[PDB]
Symmetry: D2
Subunit: 440 residues, 4 copies
């Protein structure tokens, strides 16, 4: 699945609809990023620029101009076609092909932006600009405005009002269209297949990075060349480190391994966590903690639907965790009092859910304590976990256990749809999957 | 292989030996780098900082202080141990463990650097600093020097002399030690195994990115988690684009595929290019161009040794290329006159060789036109290629062909050693490899 | 005369009246300015900050907050009282005395601005800020906004709209109140007295800077310690250089001297130019050029009134100049054709009039080609001049003559009032003044 | 007096003599400075740039290039002659006239500096640059060095060593030549005449700023158009504020007025303070404090000579002050114990002396606690004072009294010469001066 030309056009028009008449919106591409010396990281387009264009080049700026309630047009600044530069550093769209390819009215050379941008802004009332996003963009915009302010003798005038478009655009991105959901559905499927493979390939004596290798190979073979975030493969005590990415330890017989990994597919993030035994068999202690995390996830998946909130569902998860931990002797006392003093916090220190989209921790207002009421089209994660430190003062058999189970969901009219249910999470299904692979 | 504790110590002392007495050298870690929003790229340490420490954390500064010809010591600024920050964002070395782990005399918290750096620079004559390398570093150094300059009432004085250590350090990096050659040898072996795998897996109907996938999986399984540069898999007309990295096309029966890929193993880069037929059998036209590129490589591998230069070996390659292109009717005229007017340039527009090490395009002075005399311990690539554009005014059978063959070598006392010869390059050996894999 | 506490308060309220509800306006003081090494120039407050406060300290920020159409309040950030700093570098108002002295609701220490400003901006819809005016101010404002944008977990939100207040404030400053006119009337009088003194003191053999000395002494004795711009004393060929400020030549018998000088009185600028013979007697040639400039000035003074424009009056002056220059043989041809080709331009290359106020070249929109229709309360200069270069291809006796005569006026209901008419400009009155002084 | 062409040349050569071979020194003009909106303050050239050129334009850079021990030359970047710009904003020297006028070998347009500076720095070993002095200069120098560092393919190389010339130049400025002493002598005379005039014109009912007016008029009539610092006229309780410059109060019969004012003559600063009674007659209480300050000055003027230091002379002044204050009952106790606890500090909180020259607080190393040994050619102020706050817990008749007496001296082979002795300071001479003027 992919985003259509018509969809990119609908998005631009949805932004223009919200703009004041006599205004321009400026959306800048991400700069290229150095890895070491003259070598650069693989390019990642700015998510907001991507959202409106699907254009994966640096040194580009989309300018949407609204003259009035009926009249508007678009101008793209982008890199010129240069024979030498392209023979070396790959093909460029250029100005001639851009209008048809990207559906813009006019395309100009990025090298002319300082000579041209002020002419587009001249006489407008409002400029929409994400100030502070990129230094290079701020320099360009501020130079244009200073030329206008100082140009009264040349009959130039600057827009006196500057508005940050990020709140408006981020509210747009928070609600996914059917096309976006189709892409996310594919990202969830590719990511699930990778996690299934990792479970099937895992053996004691392999290093954590070997599972990272299997995962990335699986992403790649489905056309998702890059992960959406740095893959976490935390076995044994490494599972208690939330963003463990060193992945440098030999995986030991008797340990769990926690894998948090997600592909980026057409710009959209998958984000799945599975935890499983390195040797294919959960111990009683591992099983006891796993069951609490799994009940929390399964209950959350039943509960999430329009009209509730992350905060509300979190309250139900907290009760499940505290109750579970009291039965194991990890916490001691009255459940309601323990809940009241947030006694689960040492073992579950992060949020249950975040938005998901073009960024793995996606944009959009959560409300105070993530109390915002959920509506259809919102996409989020559900990721309960329990992390018991090696030095925790609890019964000894629980020490050094880190378990998280994370799925990705979309809120629908009546409930939710689980985009990542195709990789198993019940302990018996995990064990059966691993047994079958070890035959083969 | 690996770089030992003792080696890192030897490198630091070799720098200190070149410093003036009453001086300090400041070496800064790379900043973390945003990929998108709050997510960051996998961390890549600054090569110079890595060279002296083997320490893979940001927000760190190595300070080497030379009081006089016999007295010197080291101070590390690095991130403090913080229980919360580490539970979230991974373990940190901290101050207590750093002296023993990294072999430094003293370790201080990076958060204190502005309160402490000026105290270390106070009263010195010279500061060694790579000005302009990182903005955050320049801010820290300039703030320290300003405090000192303005602090005469507090009996503070600034060093009046600032020296860029990069020329000295880059000259050090240009000559590899035996330990570094052992690591580069392993990087070359891992990289060669990945290229062999790609040749064995290649089938028409696969996409270019599938071979990139096979290559990266092979790097990873040997403990090289990241490539040293973005992998190029250019099939058909994409082979004519030197740094083609989109890798987005379906590979077609009848085309060649050019793969330039290299692992990063313990910080050191492999850098290998192989070109081969997608269907396992070179056509006559493909073979005609391939043979010119291969002769260029084989001749270069015979010639490279102490006392010659990249410029000198390039001259021999240019003669091989022009002669070959004249025989095929791609160029027309007298070979010597064609050579004199650089008539090969449309088809071979890059250099034959670059230095290789902690960076794929490694540091070190080349001399004018890469005329520097080679000496033992230098590591470099040898990468002749011919790229005939789809619209080139040449016989049709040669249009749209891009071929490069690249090996990594070390200059020895008498010649060179080839670190990447374990992946095949003779056309009959390539074909035999692919036939065997397809059984 | 001076500006009352009540006037500063009226100005602040006039700005607040124009502000959107749920907004804050930020007005920053001028930074201190280095002259050499550790020594600084005498402090000059930012004109807009001065306009709203009459407060002559650096490191101060006025914040006007409008909650709604009826509720508003003011906060001042200013330097704290520090015993040591004040014993050295003079007295400071401080926080305790500021509310009563400056009529602000609340005063805070400037050293706390980064800890406090974001708290004032939190939850507002609009911030009014003159972006690009001062680097130090931009840093403060941008830091506050980034704290708010990034502080959603602490229930902080940034105003998404930023508006430049300069257009609004500069339109306010363009129209002078009766109190301001009274101050400008005094500035004009002090400046006129200085020009009269210079004429009376002038002798051949003095240096140009000696007249600058007399002028500055006269400003000072009336309580105007500083000039409003760098004094110009251009004798002989120096009179042809519009902003000649070297004032380094010995004044010669037979030359004219052009003096452009103005005091700054309570922040307001005088701006007068007189040209006169060093030896007290105009030659025929000097008189011939002087008469053209004087007719231009006198005609302009008759013409300026509500409903005309600088552009319109300039057209009448151009006709006077071209006609005059044709009769002298300086220009040759038909007057209307010469006017049509702007043939006066080599001899009169600057504008006839500029706004005057807290800045000598005062703020306010002029309109295209200074075509804006004049209204009561506007204050402007009238400064025709003719400058004939030493190498000009004209009759030889005119070469090297520079003459300008400049008065300051206020537009009134029926015409204008000349604020600088108390220094003479008719050639016979100039000569009589000088004769009388030489007795002284 | 004036500084000659030959002197500017001698100064440049004295800098070049201290430079390493294969180096360039870069000296930048001061930027223009905004007063309000489009209006600028009167231009004040950078003192170091002035010292080497006597050139009073912005957008200028002096480049001194030393090829070797015998070969050196100079390049000036300055504003081009532009007919329109000059008709408006005054005459410019330009490129054609600069070599002869300023004694430079070559002059280039400032607008070309980014196209030309890197070409001058190319291949040098050392650049002398005052980093951090001006932002515009740092941008120009950093851009040049970046072009060179990145320009190896164009056969460009950057100097790896950057040295701050300010320590060397400021040590030069610390020792005045005979020509400079002649200019400072004239500055002292002009300044003294202004102070005499202020004393003769002073009347009760005048405002403090009226005396500032008389002073500036006197500076101006002798060709010193600008003061070297903001004039202080502190009458009554304003005399206790060290840098009181508001000068806004009516001067009252019964008060003292403290005037600290100095002209700037050919770039050089006068710096004189005199305190005197507004009504022409010192009261007993005023005289009691005045006499302590005057004894301090007179003793300092006897003591200052080669081989002593500001610190050493300060010790004698402190004894005079404490002894005097004890006699008046302002301090109580044993003199030696009071001295040991610095009991004078509440009343005398600044230094006795600072260097004087192109800046009023001139450049040059003072040593710890101003302990540097004085040598011939150093120019400094001598400015004891006593400031008793209005709320000080001392006898009432001394509260709110601020007295300072300041002279400018040059250290000679055997002692010192007083450049400002032509304005009176003995109380009976002050009174006689004022009585005579009031007839
Ligand atoms: Cl471009
Ligand atoms: Cl830290
Ligand atoms: Cl403060
Ligand atoms: Cl120029
Ligand atoms: Mg996750
Ligand atoms: Mg390569
Ligand atoms: Mg073909
Ligand atoms: Mg004027
Ligand atoms: Mg003084
Ligand atoms: Mg008293
Ligand atoms: Zn997640
Ligand atoms: Zn290579
Ligand atoms: Zn004017
Ligand atoms: Zn002084």
């Amino acid at each position: 699945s992919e985003i259509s030309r018509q969809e990119f056009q609908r998005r631009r028009q949805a932004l223009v609809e919200q703009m004041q008449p006599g205004s321009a919106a400026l959306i800048f591409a991400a700069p290229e990023v150095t890895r070491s010396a003259d070598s650069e990281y693989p390019y990642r387009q700015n998510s907001d620029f991507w959202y409106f264009t699907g254009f994966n080049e640096p040194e580009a700026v989309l300018v949407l101009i609204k003259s009035d309630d009926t009249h508007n047009h678009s101008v793209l600044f982008n890199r010129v076609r240069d024979l030498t530069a392209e023979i070396w550093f790959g093909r460029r769209l250029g100005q001639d092909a851009a209008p048809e390819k990207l559906g813009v009215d006019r395309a100009l050379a990025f090298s002319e932006i300082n000579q041209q941008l002020y002419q587009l802004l001249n006489g407008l009332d409002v400029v929409y600009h994400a100030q502070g996003e990129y230094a290079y963009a701020d320099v360009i915009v501020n130079s244009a405005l200073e030329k206008l302010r100082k140009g009264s003798r040349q009959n130039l005038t600057a827009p006196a009002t500057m508005i940050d478009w990020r709140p408006v655009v981020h509210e747009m991105r928070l609600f996914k269209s059917p096309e976006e959901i189709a892409v996310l559905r594919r990202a969830g499927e590719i990511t699930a297949m990778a996690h299934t493979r990792a479970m099937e390939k895992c053996r004691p004596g392999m290093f954590e990075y070997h599972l990272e290798g299997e995962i990335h190979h699986e992403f790649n073979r489905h056309g998702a060349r890059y992960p959406s975030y740095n893959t976490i493969v935390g076995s044994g005590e490494n599972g208690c480190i939330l963003h463990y990415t060193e992945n440098e330890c030999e995986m030991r017989d008797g340990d769990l391994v926690l894998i948090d990994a997600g592909c980026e597919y057409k710009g959209y993030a998958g984000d799945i966590t599975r935890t499983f035994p390195v040797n294919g068999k959960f111990t009683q202690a591992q099983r006891e903690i796993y069951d609490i995390v799994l009940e929390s996830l399964e209950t959350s998946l039943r509960l999430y639907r329009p009209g509730t909130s992350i905060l509300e569902v979190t309250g139900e998860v907290v009760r499940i965790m505290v109750s579970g931990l009291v039965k194991l002797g990890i916490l001691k006392g009255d459940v309601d009092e323990l809940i009241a003093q947030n006694a689960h916090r040492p073992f579950f220190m992060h949020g249950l859910s975040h938005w998901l989209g073009l960024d793995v921790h996606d944009v959009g207002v959560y409300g105070q304590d993530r109390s915002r009421i959920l509506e259809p089209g919102m996409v989020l994660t559900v990721e309960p976990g329990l992390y018991i430190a090696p030095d925790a003062e609890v019964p000894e058999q629980y020490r050094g256990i880190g378990i998280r189970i994370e799925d990705d969901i979309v809120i629908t009219e009546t409930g939710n749809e689980n985009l990542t249910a195709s990789v198993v999470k019940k302990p018996e299904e995990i064990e059966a999957l691993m047994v079958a692979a070890r035959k083969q």
